[PDB]
Request: fold
Amino acid sequence: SNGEFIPHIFYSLHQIRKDETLTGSIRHRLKLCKSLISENSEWQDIIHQREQELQIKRDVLDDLYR
Amino acid sequence: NLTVSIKIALMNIPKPLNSYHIKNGRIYFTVPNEFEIQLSTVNRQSPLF
Amino acid sequence: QLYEDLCRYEDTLSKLVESPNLDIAKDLIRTDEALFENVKLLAEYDNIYRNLQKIDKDSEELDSKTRKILEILNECHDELXXXXXXXXXXXXXXXX
Reply:
């Protein structure tokens, strides 16, 4: 997901933690973050499989030449 | 069968259909049920594009 | 884990407007760091997925090539055998 929308919330959150509209805006951005993350070792395994296909075919052509 | 076997070979065959027997001019695949028979069918076509 | 992070902030602020202590803010900070790290990892995972898609496309291309070769083969088989030899034998029997 996008990582540029999170420090914007952290700035105001820092201000509130140091001290309705401020926390209201913070929540208004946090909802957009909720919908964003909701919309958006494992892949390694998958990588190998895809290449497995490529390797078998290369071996066949190499069977023709040799 | 050589033409069908490569298109069937590329597509995503469901899990209960991974086992099949390529018969002389057809693909005969089974899955057990009852009614004194086995849920097996013979498939054969022509297009591929 | 990324969603509970976003909910804790709203809950803590909602409790701060009505009143409510200092510890919950530190909890918010650690929560912040965790959220950031999770986001970055997620992005990297997305990129790797893209690579996987590319490899898939390549495989499809090779399959198409193989299919075409097979078709040309079937044509070459339909172009050409013993019947012609028999007609040549009978033709030799007709010439002599």
Remarks:
- The longest helix of chain B spans residues 2-10.
